[PDB]
Ligand binder design. Structure first.
Ligand SMILES: NC(=O)c1ccc[n+]([C@@H]2O[C@H](COP(=O)([O-])OP(=O)(O)OC[C@H]3O[C@@H](n4cnc5c(N)ncnc54)[C@H](O)[C@@H]3O)[C@@H](O)[C@H]2O)c1
Ligand SMILES: NC(=O)c1ccc[n+]([C@@H]2O[C@H](COP(=O)([O-])OP(=O)(O)OC[C@H]3O[C@@H](n4cnc5c(N)ncnc54)[C@H](O)[C@@H]3O)[C@@H](O)[C@H]2O)c1
Ligand code: NI
Ligand code: NI
Lengths: 376, 375
């Protein structure tokens, strides 16, 4: 049992200004940004800080959502050409994950994706050498927790795979609630429910400790109390949920995740995106609560509920109040059916299955997917 | 507003065996331990792991509690003689604090104590350069939180001063509850109440964040619920309180401490040791609550109490039930009244005052000490 944190976290409204203090005169900085963070003026704000710092900088913008290995490879020549000492990742989990993947392939150019990505928990991946490029993560959602995690989630053939290394942990995270105050309702809802998924999975993980549990319970408490207020546009709730998103990231960095993310990774072919975690969570909770009820009971008591059954009800009621669609509403029975057997096999191979409080069969995973689809 | 943790925390019963993982063949390792960690056979367990790792090692034992700069200077030549790459600090806050002070003076031999210790918050101390000696902190009490903190607490002339630098944060902390299970009742009480002092001062600190607050509340909740069970020999509660001490450590690494530790640093000339933080806490809370109730109320409600007034009552009741002495049991009215003025002046200059929710005068600190003596 281990607990660490590689990331120095700076927080508060206006904390984006810290960039001035983190970068030195003549430091070679490459800024990666989403279309959102460009349009909304946050990229300009970072450039003006780098200008005041007298840094040597360049900006790559309009990084895509749900990044592929092809997305990464297309950016890599620009990276090598500029020869940065420092990355700033301004945007969502998508932008922070693109930057982590570029950090690997820039700092360790002997390593290709196919050598380090965990395609199957039954096949060895190469560990990462020391990666010297400084990474400053500035999340715009609340949130993926990528600003502290050891993982980058990259698609190859419409399946999400991970590279996981403590070397990928961002050197610095800046948590400036001014950014997420700009999320559209559905982005605030989806990324806020991912916090709750992260917190519950980290708490019931085989890898859980009291240290990860303290962060996981507080993040979960904040989502259950504050998320509806944040989705309605309460700035105080937007701050609390932004910090809860990172608290859950600290939890799952140490505690790891579980079946929910193994099954959402391998259901990335489904649109809309960023729904499937929220939808699958209760079905995975009900499966795990069969043989491994104990840690769900423990978390429910810590959250001031009587038992695991009441925590499950609170999760289903929050999803209901935030109008999370049924799986059957966002995928046809034929398309779901034709991909089910391979999805279930690929999910079973995902390394997050090793942390799940119960070891699933392929058939157990297939039956969880079916249960979520039927919604009988 | 910042949150970090430089230390990798390894935990569980038998986690002491991780030493065999963290040390490579031919690594030069210097082990510091207390007499109790030698006598109870934890030093032999560590040497046995270093032997299995094929390390080049040496052991220094019989390290004093409440260490001085003279203590540290007397050991420095033995450190230089052996030329270690790695320290293992096996014992209480005292042993980890000695190990931290030696890491400064070994790694930066151009810096003396008088250049890096914060004698006064009104005068610059030198910042520390990169210190490359790896430090593995194995706390035996529950506890100082020194195994994750950026601080070492060293006496000069019977007053506690600090060196504070992220460079002093141990590389690794091993939390193995077999060690603190051996604490006699009084040591379990004193170090446990220190956790609660740490947790409350970190929460109400001017440098509090939601991250440090989460660690501080869970640490405080564990002490209020479990410390009596632990004092009474409950192995579950010993484990819980051991991890609570490090949580309060994470909390104060970030949040810092306040007027309780400023006042206990400058009252270091009182024996016994370890009581003064627990004695002073309620009086400092009452002082701070007059002007800055807000964070005490927030902490009370997090702990599922109705208000700041009830948290204060719960602290006072715990001290009562675990038989914390009054200040006038452990110091003559002669002694006290004679040093009160200079102690108050020197507590006022302690950098930890900068983090207290309320800026005290010297006279305020004088009157807190007076209310403690006169209860
Ligand atoms: N590496 C990890 O540990 C980890 C953990 C969980 C998820 N992920 C990955 O992260 C990705 C999802 O990241 P995400 O949830 O942050 O979303 P995202 O980065 O994919 O962005 C979602 C959408 O919201 C928009 N947006 C983001 N912030 C905005 C803001 N403040 N104002 C306006 N619009 C804004 C984006 O432009 C985009 O259209 C997925 O690829 C997922 O697999 C990573
Ligand atoms: N550096 C920091 O951040 C920090 C924080 C708090 C306190 N401190 C310092 O730490 C010191 C106090 O540390 P402490 O409270 O851990 O006590 P300690 O290290 O002074 O030891 C107290 C006594 O208990 C004995 N003991 C300790 N563990 C035992 C065990 N498991 N079994 C049997 N006997 C045991 C010791 O041998 C000693 O006699 C003080 O000098 C204080 O100023 C520093
Ligand atoms: Ni997620
Ligand atoms: Ni203390």
């Amino acid at each position: 049992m281990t607990f660490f944190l590689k990331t120095t976290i700076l927080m508060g409204r206006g904390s984006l200004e810290n960039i001035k203090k983190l970068v030195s005169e003549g430091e070679r900085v490459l800024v990666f940004s989403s279309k959102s963070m460009d349009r909304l003026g946050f990229l300009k704000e970072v450039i003006d800080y780098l200008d005041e710092a007298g840094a040597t900088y360049e900006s790559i913008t309009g990084l895509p959502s749900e990044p592929s290995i092809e997305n990464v490879e297309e950016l890599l020549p620009k990276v090598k050409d500029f020869s940065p000492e420092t990355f700033i990742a301004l945007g969502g989990g998508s932008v922070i994950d693109i930057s982590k993947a570029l950090k690997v392939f820039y700092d360790a150019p002997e390593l290709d994706f196919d050598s380090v990505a965990i395609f199957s928990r039954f096949k060895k991946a190469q560990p990462l050498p020391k990666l010297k490029t400084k990474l400053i993560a500035v999340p715009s959602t609340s949130g993926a927790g990528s600003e502290v995690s050891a993982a980058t989630v990259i698609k190859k053939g419409d399946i999400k795979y991970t590279i996981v290394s403590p070397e990928l942990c961002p050197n610095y995270a800046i948590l400036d609630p001014r950014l997420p105050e700009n999320m559209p309702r559905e982005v605030a809802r989806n990324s806020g429910l991912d916090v709750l998924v992260h917190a519950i999975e980290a708490y019931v993980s085989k890898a859980s400790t009291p240290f990860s549990d303290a962060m996981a319970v507080k993040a979960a408490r904040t989502i259950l109390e504050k998320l509806e207020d944040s989705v309605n546009g309460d700035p105080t709730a937007r701050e609390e949920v932004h910090y809860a998103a990172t608290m859950a990231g600290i939890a799952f960095l140490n505690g790891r995740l579980g079946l929910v993310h193994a099954m959402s990774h391998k259901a990335a072919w489904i649109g809309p995106h960023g729904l499937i975690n929220a939808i699958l969570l209760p079905y995975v909770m009900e499966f795990n609560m069969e043989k491994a009820r104990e840690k769900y009971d423990a978390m429910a008591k810590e959250l001031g509920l009587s038992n695991a059954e009441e925590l499950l009800q609170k999760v289903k009621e929050l999803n209901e109040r935030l109008n999370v669609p049924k799986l059957s509403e966002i995928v046809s029975e034929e398309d779901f059916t034709s991909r089910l057997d391979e999805m279930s096999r690929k999910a079973y191979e995902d390394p997050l299955v090793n942390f799940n409080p119960v070891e699933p069969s392929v058939d157990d995973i297939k039956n969880i997917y079916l249960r979520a689809f039927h919604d009988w």
